[PDB]
């Protein structure tokens, strides 16, 4: 359940370490973003010589969340962090690896790029 | 003296010294059919050019042609979306051909607050230049974020003015706490503001950050 203010740990080699969510991109006034939803976010930590420098404002899709998400078959999955992956408008990663698992729900949501790049899609 | 350049027009030596100019007027051949010629020709009367003759190719009768010399700038703009939208998308042009011009060069300068802007400086026909000038300044107002004084926008060449733009300032505040209403207390706060909407003008250096994709692109 990511909302504006939420720092989420970024899981691709774009060169972002942590980003803060500044809007959840889902209508006139969506309250929360979750797995496979897209935010706008400010960049709070950049390893030196990235492409995303600090204070940049990026779009990113939520890949992992601390708040368990429920699935049609009445199972659930929560992760131990909230993670994101920085994309561009075309909705595709500027990264070239993704780190950690990602949630199956990214798949129907068309983020197929991300899903293959993953180490495990739980 | 004679002088060759420069590609980006603003620089060119002052009308104090300047008795010659060149618009590398080409003349082009357009095949067209039938008559789109009436429409077309007049179009090539605005972007002024020069007829030699040319010929009807045989039919399709709507077969036909026209060889015209027009200055490079006028040609370009005037021509493509128009060129067809005029003729209904048939017809065509090729300009190879690079002649030169003795005609008129007039370039107008665009000034914001009087702080002449170099980037917006533009180059056109004396009649067209005269025509464009209104659009530039007027198209300007949406552009320039507000600074504390009535803010001149004007467009002009060599010391006479083709255009005007004025930008409102108005950094009003002050009366917003008077309520009793001596007429004269109301005035006192605007005697300090009238000095302030002046002092700030004489030391005012003003700026516009990008958004020039907007003002003087068009």
């Amino acid at each position: 359940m990511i909302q504006p203010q939420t720092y989420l740990e970024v899981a691709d080699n774009t060169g972002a370490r942590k980003i803060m969510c500044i809007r959840v991109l889902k209508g006139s006034n969506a309250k929360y973003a979750t797995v496979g939803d897209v935010i706008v976010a400010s960049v709070k930590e950049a390893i030196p010589r990235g492409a995303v420098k600090e204070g940049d404002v990026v779009k990113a899709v939520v890949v992992r969340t601390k708040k368990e998400i429920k699935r049609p078959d009445g199972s659930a999955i929560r992760f131990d962090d909230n993670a994101a992956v920085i994309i561009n408008n075309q909705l595709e990663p500027r990264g070239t690896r993704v780190f950690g698992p990602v949630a199956r729900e990214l798949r129907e949501k068309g983020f197929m790029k991300i899903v293959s790049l993953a180490p495990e899609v739980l | 003296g004679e002088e060759v350049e420069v590609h980006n027009p603003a620089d060119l030596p002052d009308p104090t010294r300047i008795e010659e100019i060149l618009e590398p007027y080409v003349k082009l051949t357009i095949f067209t059919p039938e008559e789109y010629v009436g429409s077309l020709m007049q179009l090539l009367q605005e972007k002024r050019g020069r007829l030699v003759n040319m010929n009807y190719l045989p039919g399709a009768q709507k077969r036909v042609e026209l060889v015209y010399e027009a200055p490079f700038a006028e040609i370009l703009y005037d021509f493509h979306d128009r060129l067809k939208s005029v003729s209904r998308g048939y017809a065509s042009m090729d300009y190879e051909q690079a002649g030169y011009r003795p005609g008129d060069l007039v370039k107008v300068n665009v000034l914001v607050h009087g702080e002449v802007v170099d980037a917006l400086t533009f180059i056109a026909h004396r009649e067209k230049a005269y025509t464009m000038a209104r659009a530039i300044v007027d198209k300007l107002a949406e552009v320039i974020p507000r600074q504390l004084f009535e803010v001149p926008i004007q467009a002009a060449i060599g010391g006479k003015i083709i255009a005007r733009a004025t930008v409102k300032a108005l950094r009003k505040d002050v009366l917003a706490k008077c309520y009793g209403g001596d007429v004269t207390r109301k005035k006192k706060l605007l005697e300090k503001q009238k000095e302030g909407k002046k002092r700030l003008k004489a030391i005012g250096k003003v700026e516009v950050p990008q958004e020039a994709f907007l003002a003087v692109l068009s």
Partner: protein, 227 residues
């Protein structure tokens, strides 16, 4: 051919490089102005235009009437133009064979002094640049000089292809009649025009045909970045 206008950058010059161009017309949309305008371009050169009438697979499509229209309108032999349909295995079947014959194959001595002009060029080559054209006359290959007509400036041969449709392929040298590609070190892109290629250095064809050549300033003026 660059599809679209394109302003004639790839529509004509490269028009030079064909033997026959195949004219493709829908039989659903009809015949459009790009369709006709390109014709006289191509009609302009002198070539074998083999017409087509197309889509026919689409049900509603009006096929015969198109040939009819091009008929008076475009002036092509009504009978001569073929029919296929692309989505279908279609009128295709005769397409290649028809082409060869309607199309006379190329001619020039290929060991004769180099006079090579190529329709077009490879993109980027941030690393290195490649070229296409036909060395209609002559041949050039590795251990070569190249000299390209207007000022020079004289670039040696790294290789030539020739790139099989899979991609850009080998060859010892590029030879006459044959249409391929050549290298290398050009890098400048301003001097080059389609009808100017050189040349080994040590002999020069006396005159370029040509298809040339590029233009003087300025368009543009700044392409200044924001932010």
């Amino acid at each position: 051919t660059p599809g679209h206008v394109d302003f004639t950058y790839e529509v004509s010059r490269a028009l030079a490089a064909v033997e026959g161009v195949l004219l493709v017309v829908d039989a659903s949309q009809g015949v459009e102005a790009e369709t006709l305008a390109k014709f006289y371009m191509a009609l302009e050169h002198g070539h074998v235009i083999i017409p087509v009438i197309n889509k026919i697979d689409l049900p509603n499509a009006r096929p015969l009437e198109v040939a009819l229209e091009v008929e008076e309108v475009l002036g092509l032999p009504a009978d001569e133009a073929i029919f296929a349909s692309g989505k279908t295995g279609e009128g295709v079947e005769e397409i290649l064979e028809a082409i060869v014959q309607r199309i006379p194959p190329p001619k020039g001595d290929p060991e004769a002094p180099l006079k090579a002009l190529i329709f077009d060029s490879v993109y980027d080559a941030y690393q290195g640049v490649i070229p296409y054209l036909r060395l209609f006359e002559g041949r050039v290959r590795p251990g070569d000089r190249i000299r390209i007509y207007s000022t020079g400036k004289e670039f040696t041969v790294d290789k030539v292809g020739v790139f099989t449709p899979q991609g850009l392929v080998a060859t010892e040298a590029l030879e006459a009649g044959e249409v391929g590609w050549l290298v290398a070190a050009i890098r400048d892109i301003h001097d080059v025009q389609v009808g100017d290629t050189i040349t080994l250095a040590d002999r020069p064809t006396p005159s370029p045909y040509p298809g040339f050549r590029p233009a003087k300033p300025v368009v543009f003026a700044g392409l200044y970045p924001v932010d």
